């Protein structure tokens, strides 16, 4: 399925994912498309920050959902 990841800078990234993909894996996919190291990514969905070890399904992220990406140096 596909999901969308939006920055505060007006960028939208499309990803191809599985419901069982871990957030860590979603971050790796964002790296593949944007070059952003996973350490610098904070992903946010439905009001919460996402922890690396859980899956998209755990956070109730469905097909065509939109995540939000904020970059943090540390």
């Amino acid at each position: 399925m596909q999901i969308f990841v939006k920055t505060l800078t007006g960028k939208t990234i499309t990803l191809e994912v599985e419901p069982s993909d871990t957030i860590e894996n979603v971050k790796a996919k964002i790296q593949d498309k944007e070059g952003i190291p996973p350490d610098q990514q904070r992903l946010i969905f439905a009001g919460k920050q996402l922890e690396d070890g859980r899956t998209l399904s755990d956070y109730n992220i469905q097909k065509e959902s939109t995540l939000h990406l904020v970059l943090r140096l540390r």
Partner: peptide
Amino acid sequence: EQEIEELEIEIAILLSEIEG
């Protein structure tokens, strides 16, 4: 820069309560 980041997370948290 640190405080800018904290405010950005808050914006994203709030925006994600509309864009989800």
